[PDB]
Amino acid sequence: MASETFEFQAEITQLMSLIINTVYSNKEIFLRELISNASDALDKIRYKSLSDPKQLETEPDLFIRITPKPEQKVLEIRDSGIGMTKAELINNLGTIAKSGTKAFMEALSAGADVSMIGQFGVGFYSLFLVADRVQVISKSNDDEQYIWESNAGGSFTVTLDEVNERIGRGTILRLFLKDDQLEYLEEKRIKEVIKRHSEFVAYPIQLVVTKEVE
Amino acid sequence: MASETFEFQAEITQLMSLIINTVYSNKEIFLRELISNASDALDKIRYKSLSDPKQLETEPDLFIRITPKPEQKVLEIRDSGIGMTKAELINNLGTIAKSGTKAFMEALSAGADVSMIGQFGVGFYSLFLVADRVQVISKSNDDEQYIWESNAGGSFTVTLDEVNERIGRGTILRLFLKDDQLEYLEEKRIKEVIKRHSEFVAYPIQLVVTKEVE
Numbered sequence: 001m002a003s004e005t006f007e008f009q010a011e012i013t014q015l016m017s018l019i020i021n022t023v024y025s026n027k028e029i030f031l032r033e034l035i036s037n038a039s040d041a042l043d044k045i046r047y048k049s050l051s052d053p054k055q056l057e058t059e060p061d062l063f064i065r066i067t068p069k070p071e072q073k074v075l076e077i078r079d080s081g082i083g084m085t086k087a088e089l090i091n092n093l094g095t096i097a098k099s100g101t102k103a104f105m106e107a108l109s110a111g112a113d114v115s116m117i118g119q120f121g122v123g124f125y126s127l128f129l130v131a132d133r134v135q136v137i138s139k140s141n142d143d144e145q146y147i148w149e150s151n152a153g154g155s156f157t158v159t160l161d162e163v164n165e166r167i168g169r170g171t172i173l174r175l176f177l178k179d180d181q182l183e184y185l186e187e188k189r190i191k192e193v194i195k196r197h198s199e200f201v202a203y204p205i206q207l208v209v210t211k212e213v214e
Numbered sequence: 215m216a217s218e219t220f221e222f223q224a225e226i227t228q229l230m231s232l233i234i235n236t237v238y239s240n241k242e243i244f245l246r247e248l249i250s251n252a253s254d255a256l257d258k259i260r261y262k263s264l265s266d267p268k269q270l271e272t273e274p275d276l277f278i279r280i281t282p283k284p285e286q287k288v289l290e291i292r293d294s295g296i297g298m299t300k301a302e303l304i305n306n307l308g309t310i311a312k313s314g315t316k317a318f319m320e321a322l323s324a325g326a327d328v329s330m331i332g333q334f335g336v337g338f339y340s341l342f343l344v345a346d347r348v349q350v351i352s353k354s355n356d357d358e359q360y361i362w363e364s365n366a367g368g369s370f371t372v373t374l375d376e377v378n379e380r381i382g383r384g385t386i387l388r389l390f391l392k393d394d395q396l397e398y399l400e401e402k403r404i405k406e407v408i409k410r411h412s413e414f415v416a417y418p419i420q421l422v423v424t425k426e427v428e
C-alpha cells in the first residue's frame with residue numbers, strides 16, 4: 001500500500017540528532033548493540049515457545065545473520081527473533097518516550113562514554129553513528145511484514161512490505177552507511193568487531209560473503 | 215495479486231517429463247546451461263545499451279550470482295541481464311512451441327547425450343535434472359516483476375511479485391532441489407562444476423557463501 005508518516009517523540013529526535021552528528025571515535029559499538037538486540041529478540045521467541053511450541057514453526061532456525069551489500073553501501077543485520085507488528089514498530093521505535101532517552105543525553109553531557117547507550121535501553125539508536133538512514137523490516141507471527149524507515153529527522157514512515165524478501169519471522173536492520181564508514185562492509189573488519197564485543201552470544205552469528213569464482 | 219495459470223505447449227510437458235524422470239548420470243550439466251542463459255541475457259542488455267544507454271541505469275552492475283540456501287534446499291542463479299516481461303515469460307517459457315523441443319527428444323531416443331540439450335535451444339529445461347520445482351523471477355525495464363512457476367506438470371502459473379526482493383533488472387532462477395541432489399548446495403561442488411564447464415564467460419560469476427563466525 002502507501003506509507004504512513006508518524007512523528008517522533010521529541011526527546012528521541014534530539015537523541016538521534018546528537019548521535020548522527022558527533023565525531024565520537026569508537027563508532028564500531030553500534031554492532032554490539034544491534035547483535036545484542038537481536039539476541040534479546042531471539043530469547044523472547046524461545047521463551048514464548050516454551051508454552052506455545054507452534055510459534056517457532058514459521059522459521060525454525062534461530063540465528064543472527066550479517067549481510068554486507070557493498071554496491072548499495074548497505075549493511076543488513078537479520079535475526080529470526082520474535083519480530084514486531086506494525087503497532088509495535090510504531091510504539092517501540094518512535095512515538096513512545098523511551099525510558100532512558102533523556103537520562104542518556106544528560107549522562108553524555110556530563111562526560112559519559114557513548115558506549116553506555118545500551119544500559120539506558122536506547123542502543124538501537126547507536127546505528128546513526130555509522131548510518132544516515134535505516135529501514136527496520138519486521139515480521140511477527142501476529143502481523144504482516146512492514147517497513148519502518150527513518151533518516152534521523154523528526155518523523156518516520158511505516159509501510160506494508162510488498163518489496164522485500166519474506167522473512168518467515170524476525171527482523172532485518174537495513175543500514176544505509178555513510179561514505180566515511182564503508183569499512184563495515186568488509187569481512188575482516190566485521191569479524192574483528194564481533195570477536196572484540198559479542199563473545200558471549202548464545203546464537204550462531206552468520207556472515208554472508210560474496211566471492212567471485214576463480 | 216492472484217496467480218494466472220497457463221497450459222504448456224504439449225511437446226514441452228513431454229520433454230520436461232522425460233528429463234525429470236531419467237536416471238541419466240551427468241546431471242551437473244544443468245549449471246552450465248543456466249550460466250550460459252545468464253550470459254546470453256547479459257549480452258542482450260549490453261548490446262541494447264549501445265544505442266540506448268539509460269537501459270543499464272536500473273542495475274549498472276553486470277554479473278551472474280549463485281546463492282545456495284541449504285535450509286530451504288534451494289539454489290538461486292541470478293543475473294542482471296535484460297530480464298523478461300510477463301508476456302515474455304509466458305511465451306518464451308511455456309505456451310510457444312520451442313524450436314528444437316521435439317527434435318531434441320528424437321535425438322535422445324536415438325542415443326544422444328543429454329548434454330546436447332543446449333544446442334537444441336532448450337537448455338533451460340535441464341534444470342529438472344536436479345530440481346523438482348522452479349520459480350523464474352524476472353524484472354525487465356519494460357514491466358513489473360513477476361514470478362513464473364512450474365513443477366514439470368502440464369501447466370504453469372504467473373504471478374505479479376509482491377513477495378521477493380526487488381531485482382533492479384534481470385532474472386533469478388530459484389531451484390527447489392531434489393533430496394538426492396543437495397550436493398549442489400555446496401561450495402566446493404559448485405566451484406568444481408563451474409571450473410569444468412564455464413571457463414569462457416565474460417561476466418563475473420559470484421558465489422554467495424554463509425559462514426558462522428568464530
Ligand SMILES: CN1CC/C=C/CCCCCC(=O)Cc2c(Cl)c(O)cc(O)c2C1=O
Pocket residue numbers: 034037038040041042044079081082083084092093124138170171173
Ligand atoms: C527486540 N525485538 C523484539 C521486540 C521487542 C521490543 C521491545 C524493545 C524495542 C526496542 C527496539 C528493538 O530492540 C527492536 C529489534 C531490534 Cl532494534 C533489532 O536490532 C533486532 C530485533 O530482532 C528487534 C526485535 O524484534
Ligand SMILES: CN1CC/C=C/CCCCCC(=O)Cc2c(Cl)c(O)cc(O)c2C1=O
Pocket residue numbers: 248251252254255256258293295296297298306307338352384385387
Ligand atoms: C535469456 N534471458 C533474456 C530473455 C530471452 C529470451 C529468449 C530466450 C528464452 C529462453 C529462456 C531463457 O533463457 C530465459 C533466461 C534464463 Cl532461462 C535464465 O536462466 C537467465 C536469464 O537471464 C534469462 C533471460 O532473462
